[PDB]
XYZ file of C-alpha atoms in Angstrom:
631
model
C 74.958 -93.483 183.123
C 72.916 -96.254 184.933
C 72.002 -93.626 187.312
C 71.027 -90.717 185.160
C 69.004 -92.826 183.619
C 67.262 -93.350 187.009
C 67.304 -90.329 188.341
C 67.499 -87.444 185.187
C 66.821 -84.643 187.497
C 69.364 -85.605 190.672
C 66.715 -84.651 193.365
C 68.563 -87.824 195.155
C 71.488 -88.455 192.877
C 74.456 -86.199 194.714
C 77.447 -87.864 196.743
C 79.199 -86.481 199.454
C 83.054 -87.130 199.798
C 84.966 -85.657 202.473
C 82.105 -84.272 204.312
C 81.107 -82.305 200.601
C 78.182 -83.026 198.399
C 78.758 -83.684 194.746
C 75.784 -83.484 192.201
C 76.403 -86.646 189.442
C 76.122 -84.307 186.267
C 79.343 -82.540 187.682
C 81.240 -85.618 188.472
C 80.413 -86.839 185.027
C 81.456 -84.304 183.512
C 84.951 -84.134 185.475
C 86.105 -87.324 183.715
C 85.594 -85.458 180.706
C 89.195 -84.388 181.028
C 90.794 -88.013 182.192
C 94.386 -89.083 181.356
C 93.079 -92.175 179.430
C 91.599 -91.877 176.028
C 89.141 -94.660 176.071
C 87.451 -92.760 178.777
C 86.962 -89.609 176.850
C 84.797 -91.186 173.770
C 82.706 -93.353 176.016
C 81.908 -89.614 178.193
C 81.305 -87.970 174.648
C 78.774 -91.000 173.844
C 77.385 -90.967 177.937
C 76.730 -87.070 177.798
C 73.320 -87.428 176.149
C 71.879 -88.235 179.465
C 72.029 -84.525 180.651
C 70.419 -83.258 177.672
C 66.710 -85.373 177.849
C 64.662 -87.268 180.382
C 65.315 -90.745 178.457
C 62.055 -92.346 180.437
C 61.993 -89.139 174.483
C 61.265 -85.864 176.820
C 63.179 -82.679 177.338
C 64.909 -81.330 180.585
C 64.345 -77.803 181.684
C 66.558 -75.221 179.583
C 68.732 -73.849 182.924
C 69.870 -77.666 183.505
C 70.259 -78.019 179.882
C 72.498 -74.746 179.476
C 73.957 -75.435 182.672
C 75.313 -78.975 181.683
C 76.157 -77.497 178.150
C 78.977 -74.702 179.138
C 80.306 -77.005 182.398
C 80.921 -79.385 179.020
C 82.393 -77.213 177.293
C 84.516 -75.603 179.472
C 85.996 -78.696 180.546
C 86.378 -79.525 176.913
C 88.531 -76.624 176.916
C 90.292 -77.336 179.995
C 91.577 -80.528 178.520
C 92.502 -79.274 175.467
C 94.745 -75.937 177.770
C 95.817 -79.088 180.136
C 99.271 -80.382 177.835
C 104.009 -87.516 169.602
C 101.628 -84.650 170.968
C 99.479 -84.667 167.616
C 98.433 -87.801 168.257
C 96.746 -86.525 171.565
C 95.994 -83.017 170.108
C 94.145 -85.051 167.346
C 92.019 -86.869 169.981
C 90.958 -84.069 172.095
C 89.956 -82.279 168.825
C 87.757 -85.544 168.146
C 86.751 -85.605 171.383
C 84.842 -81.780 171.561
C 83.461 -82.828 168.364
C 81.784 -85.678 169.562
C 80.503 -83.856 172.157
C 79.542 -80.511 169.863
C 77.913 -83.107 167.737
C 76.137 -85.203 170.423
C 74.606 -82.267 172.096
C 73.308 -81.220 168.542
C 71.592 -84.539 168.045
C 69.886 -85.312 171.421
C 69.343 -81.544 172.510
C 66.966 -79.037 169.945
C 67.025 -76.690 172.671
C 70.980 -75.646 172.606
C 71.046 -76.058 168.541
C 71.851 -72.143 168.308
C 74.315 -72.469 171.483
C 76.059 -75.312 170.182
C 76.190 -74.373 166.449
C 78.033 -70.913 167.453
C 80.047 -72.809 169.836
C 81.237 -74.976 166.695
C 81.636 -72.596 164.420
C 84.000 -70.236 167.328
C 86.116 -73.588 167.809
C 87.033 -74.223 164.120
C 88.825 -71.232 163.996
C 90.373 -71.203 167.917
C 91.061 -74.950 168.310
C 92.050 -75.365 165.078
C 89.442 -78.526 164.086
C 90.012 -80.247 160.582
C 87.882 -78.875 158.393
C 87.062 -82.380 156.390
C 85.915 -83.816 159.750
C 83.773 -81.300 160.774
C 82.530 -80.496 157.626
C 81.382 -84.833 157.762
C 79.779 -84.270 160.634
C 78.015 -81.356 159.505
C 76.357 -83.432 156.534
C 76.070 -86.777 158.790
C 73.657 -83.931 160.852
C 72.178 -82.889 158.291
C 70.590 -86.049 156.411
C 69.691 -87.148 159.990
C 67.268 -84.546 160.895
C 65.847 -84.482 157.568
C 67.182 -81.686 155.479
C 67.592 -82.641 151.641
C 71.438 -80.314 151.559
C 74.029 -79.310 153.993
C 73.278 -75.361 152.924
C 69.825 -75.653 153.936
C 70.977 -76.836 157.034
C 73.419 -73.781 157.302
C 71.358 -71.026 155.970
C 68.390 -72.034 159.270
C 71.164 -71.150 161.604
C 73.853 -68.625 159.653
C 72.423 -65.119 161.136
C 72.625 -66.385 164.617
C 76.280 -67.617 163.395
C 77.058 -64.119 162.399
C 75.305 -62.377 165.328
C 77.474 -64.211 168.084
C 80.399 -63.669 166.014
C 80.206 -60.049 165.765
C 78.855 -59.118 168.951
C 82.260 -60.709 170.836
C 83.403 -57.130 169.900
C 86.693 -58.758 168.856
C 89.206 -57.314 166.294
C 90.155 -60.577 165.605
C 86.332 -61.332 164.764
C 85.474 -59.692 161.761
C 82.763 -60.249 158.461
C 86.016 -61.136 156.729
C 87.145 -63.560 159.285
C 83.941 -65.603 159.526
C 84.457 -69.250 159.091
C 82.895 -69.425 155.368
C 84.892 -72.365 154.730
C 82.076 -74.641 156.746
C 79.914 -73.838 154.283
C 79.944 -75.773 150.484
C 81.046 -72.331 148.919
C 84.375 -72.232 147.109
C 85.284 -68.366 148.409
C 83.766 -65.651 150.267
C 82.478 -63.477 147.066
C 80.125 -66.907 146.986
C 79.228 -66.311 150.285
C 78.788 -62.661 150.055
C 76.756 -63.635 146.909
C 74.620 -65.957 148.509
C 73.887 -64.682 152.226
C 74.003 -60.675 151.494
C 70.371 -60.399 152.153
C 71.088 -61.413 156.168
C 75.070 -59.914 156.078
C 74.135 -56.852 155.260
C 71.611 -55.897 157.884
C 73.465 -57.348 160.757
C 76.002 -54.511 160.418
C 73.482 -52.249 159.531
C 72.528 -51.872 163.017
C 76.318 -51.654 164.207
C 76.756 -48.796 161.479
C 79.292 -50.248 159.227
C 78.318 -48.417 155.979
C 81.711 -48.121 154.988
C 81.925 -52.524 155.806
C 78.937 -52.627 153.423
C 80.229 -50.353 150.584
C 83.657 -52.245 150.383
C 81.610 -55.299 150.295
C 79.244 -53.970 147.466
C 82.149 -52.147 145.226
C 83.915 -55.485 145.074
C 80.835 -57.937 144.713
C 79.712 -55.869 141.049
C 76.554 -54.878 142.297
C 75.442 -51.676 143.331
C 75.303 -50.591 147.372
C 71.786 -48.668 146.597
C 70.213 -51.824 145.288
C 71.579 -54.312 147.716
C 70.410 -51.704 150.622
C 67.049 -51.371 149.387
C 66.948 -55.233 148.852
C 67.614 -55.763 152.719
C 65.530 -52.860 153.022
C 62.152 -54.638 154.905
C 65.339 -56.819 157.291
C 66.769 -53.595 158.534
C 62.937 -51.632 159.029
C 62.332 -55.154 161.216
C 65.128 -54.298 163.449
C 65.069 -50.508 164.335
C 61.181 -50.064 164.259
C 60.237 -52.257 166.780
C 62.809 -50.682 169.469
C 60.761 -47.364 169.543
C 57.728 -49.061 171.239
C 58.060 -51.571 173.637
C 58.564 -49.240 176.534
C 59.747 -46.834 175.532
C 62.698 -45.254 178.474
C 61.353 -47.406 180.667
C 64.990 -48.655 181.725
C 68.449 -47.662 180.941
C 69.450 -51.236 179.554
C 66.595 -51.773 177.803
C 66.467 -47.657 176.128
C 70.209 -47.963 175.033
C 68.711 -50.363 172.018
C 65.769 -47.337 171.471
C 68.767 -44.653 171.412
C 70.528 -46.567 169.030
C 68.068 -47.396 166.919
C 66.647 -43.344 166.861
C 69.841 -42.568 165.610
C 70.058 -45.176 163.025
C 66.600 -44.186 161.865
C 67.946 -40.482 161.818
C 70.933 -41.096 160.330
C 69.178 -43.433 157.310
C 66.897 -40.000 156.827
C 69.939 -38.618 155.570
C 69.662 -37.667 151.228
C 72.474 -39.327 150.647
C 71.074 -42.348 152.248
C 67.601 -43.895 151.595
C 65.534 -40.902 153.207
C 65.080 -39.703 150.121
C 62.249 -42.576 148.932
C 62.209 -44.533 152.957
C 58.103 -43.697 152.555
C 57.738 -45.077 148.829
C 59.836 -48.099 149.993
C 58.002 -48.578 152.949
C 54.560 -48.234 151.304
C 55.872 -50.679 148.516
C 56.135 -53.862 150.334
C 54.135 -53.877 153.531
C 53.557 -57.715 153.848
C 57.295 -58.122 153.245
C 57.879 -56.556 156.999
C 54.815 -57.929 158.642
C 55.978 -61.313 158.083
C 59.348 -60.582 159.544
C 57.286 -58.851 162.247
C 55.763 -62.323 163.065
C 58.435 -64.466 162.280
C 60.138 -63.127 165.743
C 57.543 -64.337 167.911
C 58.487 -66.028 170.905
C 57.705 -66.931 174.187
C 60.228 -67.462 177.198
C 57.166 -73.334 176.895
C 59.926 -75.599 176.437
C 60.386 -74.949 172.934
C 64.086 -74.294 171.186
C 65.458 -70.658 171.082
C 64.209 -69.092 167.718
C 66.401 -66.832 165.640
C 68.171 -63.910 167.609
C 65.805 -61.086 166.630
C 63.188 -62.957 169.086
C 59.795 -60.300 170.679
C 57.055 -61.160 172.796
C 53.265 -60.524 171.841
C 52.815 -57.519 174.015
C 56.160 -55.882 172.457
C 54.723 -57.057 169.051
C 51.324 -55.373 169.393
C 52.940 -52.092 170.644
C 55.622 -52.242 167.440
C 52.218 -52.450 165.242
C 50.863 -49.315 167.311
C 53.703 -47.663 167.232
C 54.062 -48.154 162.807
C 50.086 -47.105 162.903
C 50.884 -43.825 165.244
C 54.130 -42.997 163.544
C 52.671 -42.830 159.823
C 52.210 -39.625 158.182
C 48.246 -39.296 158.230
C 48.407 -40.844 161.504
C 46.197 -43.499 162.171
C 45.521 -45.811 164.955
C 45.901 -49.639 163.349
C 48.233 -51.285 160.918
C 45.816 -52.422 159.182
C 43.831 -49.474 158.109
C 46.841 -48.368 155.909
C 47.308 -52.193 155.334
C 43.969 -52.067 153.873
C 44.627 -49.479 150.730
C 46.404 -52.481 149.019
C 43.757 -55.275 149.653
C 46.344 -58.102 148.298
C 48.553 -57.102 151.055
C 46.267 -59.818 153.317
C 46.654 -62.562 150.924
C 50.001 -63.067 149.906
C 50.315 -62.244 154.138
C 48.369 -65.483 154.387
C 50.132 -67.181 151.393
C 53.424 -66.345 153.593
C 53.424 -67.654 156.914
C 52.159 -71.109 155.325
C 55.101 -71.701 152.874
C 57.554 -71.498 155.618
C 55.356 -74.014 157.839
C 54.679 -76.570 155.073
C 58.606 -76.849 154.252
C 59.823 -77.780 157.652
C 59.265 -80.877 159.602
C 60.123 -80.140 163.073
C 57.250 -80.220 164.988
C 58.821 -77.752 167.520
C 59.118 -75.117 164.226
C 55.272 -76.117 163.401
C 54.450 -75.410 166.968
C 56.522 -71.564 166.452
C 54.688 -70.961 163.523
C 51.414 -71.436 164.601
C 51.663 -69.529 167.649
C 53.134 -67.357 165.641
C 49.637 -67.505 163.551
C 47.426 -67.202 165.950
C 48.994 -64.458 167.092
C 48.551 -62.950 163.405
C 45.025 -63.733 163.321
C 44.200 -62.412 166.914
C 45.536 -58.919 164.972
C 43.239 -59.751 162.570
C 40.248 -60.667 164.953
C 40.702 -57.368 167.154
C 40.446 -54.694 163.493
C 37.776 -56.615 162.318
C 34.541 -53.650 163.356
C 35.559 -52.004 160.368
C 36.483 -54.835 158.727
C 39.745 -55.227 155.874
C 37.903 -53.907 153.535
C 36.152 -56.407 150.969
C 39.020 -59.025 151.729
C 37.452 -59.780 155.226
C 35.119 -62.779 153.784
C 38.480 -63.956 151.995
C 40.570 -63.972 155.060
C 38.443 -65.559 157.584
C 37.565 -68.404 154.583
C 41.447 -69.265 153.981
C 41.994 -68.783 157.849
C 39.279 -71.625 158.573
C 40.276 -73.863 155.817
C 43.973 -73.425 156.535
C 42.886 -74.422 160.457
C 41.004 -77.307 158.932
C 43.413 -78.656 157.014
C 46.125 -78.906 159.993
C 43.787 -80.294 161.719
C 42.983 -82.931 159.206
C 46.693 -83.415 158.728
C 47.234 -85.574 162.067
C 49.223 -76.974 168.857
C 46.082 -78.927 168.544
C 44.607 -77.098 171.405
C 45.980 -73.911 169.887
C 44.372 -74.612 166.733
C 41.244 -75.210 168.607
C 41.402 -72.147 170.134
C 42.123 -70.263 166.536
C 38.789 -71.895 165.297
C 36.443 -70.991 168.005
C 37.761 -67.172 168.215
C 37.186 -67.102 164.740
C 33.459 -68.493 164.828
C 32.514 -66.529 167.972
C 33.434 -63.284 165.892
C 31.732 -64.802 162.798
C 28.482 -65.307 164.609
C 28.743 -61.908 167.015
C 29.690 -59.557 164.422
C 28.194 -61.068 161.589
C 25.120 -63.095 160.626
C 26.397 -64.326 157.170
C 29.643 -64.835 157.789
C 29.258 -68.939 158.052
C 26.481 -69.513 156.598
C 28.247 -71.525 153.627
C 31.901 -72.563 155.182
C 30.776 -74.178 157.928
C 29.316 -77.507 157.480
C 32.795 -79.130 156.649
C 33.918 -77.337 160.244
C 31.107 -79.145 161.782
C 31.252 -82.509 160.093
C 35.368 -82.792 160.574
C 36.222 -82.685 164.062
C 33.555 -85.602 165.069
C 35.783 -88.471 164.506
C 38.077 -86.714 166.728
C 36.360 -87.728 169.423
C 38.294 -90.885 170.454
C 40.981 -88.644 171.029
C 42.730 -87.553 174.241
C 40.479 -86.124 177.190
C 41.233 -82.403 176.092
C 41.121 -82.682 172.811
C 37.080 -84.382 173.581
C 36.479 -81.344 175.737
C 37.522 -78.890 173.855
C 35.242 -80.948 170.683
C 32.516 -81.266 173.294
C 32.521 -77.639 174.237
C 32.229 -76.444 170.542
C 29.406 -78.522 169.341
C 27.828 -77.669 172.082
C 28.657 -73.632 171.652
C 27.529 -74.165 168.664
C 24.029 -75.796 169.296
C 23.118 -73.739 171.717
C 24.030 -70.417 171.777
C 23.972 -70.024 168.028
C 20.696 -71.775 167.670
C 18.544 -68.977 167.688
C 19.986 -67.261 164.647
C 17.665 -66.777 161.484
C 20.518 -66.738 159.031
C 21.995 -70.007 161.019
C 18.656 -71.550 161.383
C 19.001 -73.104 158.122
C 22.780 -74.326 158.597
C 21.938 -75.860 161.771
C 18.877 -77.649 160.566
C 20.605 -78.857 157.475
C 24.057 -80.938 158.818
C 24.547 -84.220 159.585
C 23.484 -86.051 162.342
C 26.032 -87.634 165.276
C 25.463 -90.997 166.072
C 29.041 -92.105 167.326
C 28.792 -91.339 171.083
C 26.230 -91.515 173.816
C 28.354 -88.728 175.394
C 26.802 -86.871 172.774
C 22.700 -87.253 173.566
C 22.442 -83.380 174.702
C 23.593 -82.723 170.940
C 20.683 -85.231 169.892
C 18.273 -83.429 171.943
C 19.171 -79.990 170.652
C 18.985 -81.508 166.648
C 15.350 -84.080 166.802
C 14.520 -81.111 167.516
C 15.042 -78.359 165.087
C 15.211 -81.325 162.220
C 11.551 -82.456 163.357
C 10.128 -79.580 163.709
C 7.399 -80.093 161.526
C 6.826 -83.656 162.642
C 8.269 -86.894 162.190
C 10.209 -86.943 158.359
C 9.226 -89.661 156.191
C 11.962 -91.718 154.198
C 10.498 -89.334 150.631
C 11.915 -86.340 153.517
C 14.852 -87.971 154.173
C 15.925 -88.770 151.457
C 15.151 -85.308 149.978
C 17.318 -83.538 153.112
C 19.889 -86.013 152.161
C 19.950 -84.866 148.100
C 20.408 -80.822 149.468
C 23.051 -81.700 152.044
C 24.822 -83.662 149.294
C 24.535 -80.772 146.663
C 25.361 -78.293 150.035
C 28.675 -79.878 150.744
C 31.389 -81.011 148.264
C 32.981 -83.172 150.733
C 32.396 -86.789 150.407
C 34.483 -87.469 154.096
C 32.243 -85.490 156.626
C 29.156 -86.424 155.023
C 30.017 -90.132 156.098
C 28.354 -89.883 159.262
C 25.187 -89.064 157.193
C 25.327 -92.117 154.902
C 24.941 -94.470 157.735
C 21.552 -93.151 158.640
C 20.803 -93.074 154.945
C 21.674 -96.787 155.259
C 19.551 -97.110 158.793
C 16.332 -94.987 156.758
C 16.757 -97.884 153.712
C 16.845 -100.601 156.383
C 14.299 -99.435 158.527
C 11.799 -98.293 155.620
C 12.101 -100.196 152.897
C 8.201 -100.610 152.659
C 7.957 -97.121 151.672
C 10.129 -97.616 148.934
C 6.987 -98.932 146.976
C 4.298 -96.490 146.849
C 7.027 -93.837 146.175
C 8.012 -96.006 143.077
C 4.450 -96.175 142.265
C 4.110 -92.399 142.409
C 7.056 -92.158 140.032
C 5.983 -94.052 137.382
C 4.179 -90.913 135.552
C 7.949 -89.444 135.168
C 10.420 -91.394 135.817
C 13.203 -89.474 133.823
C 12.846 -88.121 137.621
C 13.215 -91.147 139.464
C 14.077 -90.044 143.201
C 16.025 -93.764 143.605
C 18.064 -93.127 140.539
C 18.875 -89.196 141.677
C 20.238 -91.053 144.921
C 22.674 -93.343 143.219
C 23.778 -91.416 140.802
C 24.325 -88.817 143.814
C 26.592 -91.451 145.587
C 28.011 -92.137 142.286
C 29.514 -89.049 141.831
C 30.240 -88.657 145.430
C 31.794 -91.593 144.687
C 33.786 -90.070 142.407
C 34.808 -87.344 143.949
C 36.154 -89.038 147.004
C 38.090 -91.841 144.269
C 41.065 -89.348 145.393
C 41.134 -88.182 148.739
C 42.269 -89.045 151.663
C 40.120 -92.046 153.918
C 38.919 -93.300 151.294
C 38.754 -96.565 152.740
C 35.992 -95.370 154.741
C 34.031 -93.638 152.344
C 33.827 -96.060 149.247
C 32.791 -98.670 152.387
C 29.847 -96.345 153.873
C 28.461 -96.016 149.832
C 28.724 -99.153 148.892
C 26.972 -100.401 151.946
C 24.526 -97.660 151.200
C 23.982 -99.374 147.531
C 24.079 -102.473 148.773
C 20.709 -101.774 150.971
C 18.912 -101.261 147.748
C 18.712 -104.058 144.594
C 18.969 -103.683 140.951
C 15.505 -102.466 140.470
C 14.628 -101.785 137.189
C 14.024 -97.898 136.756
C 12.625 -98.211 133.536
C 15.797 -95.368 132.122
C 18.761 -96.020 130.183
C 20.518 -92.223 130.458
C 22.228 -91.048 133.428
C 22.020 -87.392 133.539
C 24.584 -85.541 136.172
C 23.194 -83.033 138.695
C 24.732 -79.473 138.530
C 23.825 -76.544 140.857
C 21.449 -73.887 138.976
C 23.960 -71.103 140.227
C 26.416 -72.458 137.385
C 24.172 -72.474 135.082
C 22.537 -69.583 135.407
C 25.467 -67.523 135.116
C 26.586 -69.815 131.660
C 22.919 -68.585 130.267
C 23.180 -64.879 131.408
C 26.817 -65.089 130.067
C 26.063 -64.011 125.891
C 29.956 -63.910 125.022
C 32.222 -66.794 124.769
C 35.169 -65.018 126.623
C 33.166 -63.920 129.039
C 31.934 -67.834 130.220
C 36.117 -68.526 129.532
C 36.982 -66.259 132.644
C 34.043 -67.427 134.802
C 34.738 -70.961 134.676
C 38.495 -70.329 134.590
C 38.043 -67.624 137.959
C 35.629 -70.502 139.413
């Protein structure tokens, strides 16, 4: 053990007896199998050395496999190698220590080791109460609130493995159901139908499925057509990715053609496959992106598993195979313009229930490569749901950003702005301030993460500086005094801000009231306040004449439109997150300025005319009801 620790990888670590080297991990593992017992728990407990680096990082997924099956085939080995109860009891403890152990310290073999368990309860005959203990003891230490949540994030692998040992003695009847906290298997047919079913779907056990259904009370057509979107999932996708391009690899397309041909059948769902498959298009595109995955050192996802070139020919090939023939998904996909949303209020609810960061890291590649599909259909646009799309896209990216892949998400945002700014000029003209204003504080991050910052400020200084439509947006943010790294950025915004000359602190103070009304977020604009601070410090001898000038109206005080501005900025930011920071940078900003009497008693709260002028041109009560309620 003192060893492995030392050296994980064994570029030194082998021994040569008899004139015969020996790696350690080997060795180890032989005293898996020793005559004495003591040995074989202290092994069990040992055997998370081959599994991580212990100097908290992972090992490379051949060692890890490697190390895995040499464990448990020695495992087995013992257990072949015979009062005897007694012992028979402690080698069943002992592969359970080490089927839990290399659950625990190794996310990589969770699928290997899971099927590995589930094939030993039934052939090595393991006590169901133990295993079932350890199952929960696993389950409330990753995280997971119940024992079935753990099993249902693993059972179709479970059920793949076991029915593709092409064993009579391995059948859907013979699965170990028991594991699991239902009574009987009619619970377990009731509660995992929607993956059973189109497992043996593929293998073309209709007559499995309708002896299942006849005895379940429930109706084959409906459970079908239920499982319906899990079975499209499976055979589409074979008909593209090269298609005869090898033997091995076209066996799965031949199968899957005569699957497909076979389901045309009347009696089958051929009859209504095309209203079916029109019905519920985001329910296959998720499952479409849900097998994403690329062979770096991440665990292995769910069995169906495609990379992102076979995923963007299964898209071509649904586009080219559709009945009016077209050339993208998402022309079709853009008849029901909903089909986008719910799309986008999909992938999230998956990501925001887990808490593995190796899942988070799946789904978002998994995202980006959704919204690269999105990004490369986007001449013609979705339809009218494009503006919609690329807003929840950006404030989706935002908000996992705020929440701390990075890089990833990086990337996501700056494809997204170069094809707002190339092929639009409107595009972020509103939703971009908060873009601009959030990732400044990242700064005192790592050295990529300040590149990668670095290189889109300054992307988006420079080369989107000449816009018109942007000319506005750029001269109206916030200004970035945190860094002297950042002085190009400060001679790119004097610049445009002083265009006209040098502002006054009536100008400032005025830029500050639109960006304030501009942006509804308190957090970004804190940057800001601090120069409102330095322009109260630095000018308070300004702050007379302006006072003097204000004493015709002052219902219309410009002082008291400031603080009642931070007020409700104030507010606002009362419930949000850093607001530590925030309340700080106000009341410092208050604090620059005395009670000074402003001769006004009422406080009247700023609204944007755009409100207001829809209220007026609104003449029916129900009609103002659905606009504030829609707003």
């Amino acid at each position: 053990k003192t060893l492995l620790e030392a050296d994980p990888y064994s570029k030194w670590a082998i021994l040569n007896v008899m004139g015969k080297d020996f790696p350690v991990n080997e060795v180890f593992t032989q005293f898996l199998a020793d005559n004495h017992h003591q040995v074989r728990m202290l092994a069990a407990e040992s055997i998370n050395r081959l599994f991580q680096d212990t100097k908290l990082k992972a090992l490379p997924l051949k060692l890890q496999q490697t190390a895995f099956e040499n464990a448990y085939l020695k495992a087995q080995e013992g257990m072949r190698e015979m009062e005897t109860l007694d012992e028979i009891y402690n080698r069943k403890s002992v592969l359970l220590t080490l089927i839990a152990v290399v659950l625990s310290c190794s996310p990589i073999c969770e699928k290997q080791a899971l099927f590995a368990l589930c094939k030993s309860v039934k052939e090595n005959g393991l006590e169901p109460h133990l295993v079932k203990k350890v199952l929960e003891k696993v389950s409330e230490t990753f995280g997971y609130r119940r024992l079935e949540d753990f099993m249902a994030s693993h059972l179709d692998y479970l059920v793949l493995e076991w029915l593709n040992l092409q064993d009579t003695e391995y059948n859907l009847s013979s699965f170990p159901f028991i594991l699991l906290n239902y009574t009987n298997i009619e619970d377990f047919y009731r509660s995992c139908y929607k993956v059973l079913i189109p497992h043996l779907v593929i293998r073309s056990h209709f007559d499995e499925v309708k002896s299942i259904a006849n005895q379940i009370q429930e109706d084959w057509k409906s459970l079908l057509t239920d499982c319906f979107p899990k079975i499209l999932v499976n055979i589409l996708p074979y008909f593209a990715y090269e298609g005869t391009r090898d033997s091995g690899m076209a066996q799965q397309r031949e199968t899957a053609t005569k699957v497909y041909d076979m389901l045309k059948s009347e009696n089958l769902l051929g009859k209504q496959i095309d209203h079916l498959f029109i019905s519920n298009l985001p329910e296959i595109v998720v499952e479409l992106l849900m097998t994403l995955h690329e062979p770096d050192l991440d665990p292995a996802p769910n069995p169906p598993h495609f990379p992102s070139h076979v995923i963007k020919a299964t898209f071509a090939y649904i586009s080219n195979c559709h009945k009016t023939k077209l050339k993208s998904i998402l022309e079709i996909l853009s008849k029901s313009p909903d089909s986008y949303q719910k799309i986008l209020l999909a992938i999230c609810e998956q990501a925001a229930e887990t808490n593995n960061v190796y899942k988070k890291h799946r789904i978002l590649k998994i995202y980006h490569l959704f919204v690269s599909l999105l990004l490369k259909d986007i001449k013609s646009g979705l339809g009218g749901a494009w503006a919609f799309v690329l807003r929840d896209v950006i404030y989706t990216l935002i908000h996992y950003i705020n929440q701390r892949s990075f890089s990833l998400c990086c990337d996501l945002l700056s494809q997204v702005c170069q094809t707002a700014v190339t092929y639009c000029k409107d595009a972020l003209e509103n939703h971009l301030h908060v873009i601009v204003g959030t990732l400044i504080p990242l700064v005192y991050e790592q050295v990529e993460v300040q590149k990668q910052v670095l290189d889109l400020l300054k992307y988006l200084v420079i080369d989107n500086k000449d816009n018109e439509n942007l000319y506005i947006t750029i001269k109206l943010l916030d200004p970035f005094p945190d860094h002297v790294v950042f002085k190009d950025l400060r001679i790119t915004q004097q610049k445009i801000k002083y265009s006209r000359g040098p502002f006054s602190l009536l100008e400032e103070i005025n830029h500050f009231l639109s960006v304030s009304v501009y942006d509804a977020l308190p957090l970004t604009r804190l940057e800001g306040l601090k120069d409102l601070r330095r322009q109260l410090e630095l000018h308070k001898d300004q702050m007379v004449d302006i006072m003097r000038a204000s004493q015709d109206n002052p219902q219309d005080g410009i002082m008291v439109k400031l603080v009642v501005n931070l007020l409700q900025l104030s507010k606002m930011a009362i419930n949000h997150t850093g607001e530590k920071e925030v309340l700080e940078a106000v009341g410092s900003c208050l604090g620059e300025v005395g009670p000074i009497d402003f001769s006004t008693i009422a406080i009247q709260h700023s609204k944007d005319a755009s409100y207001t002028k829809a209220l007026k041109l609104f003449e029916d009560k129900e009609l103002q009801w659905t606009f504030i309620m829609l707003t």
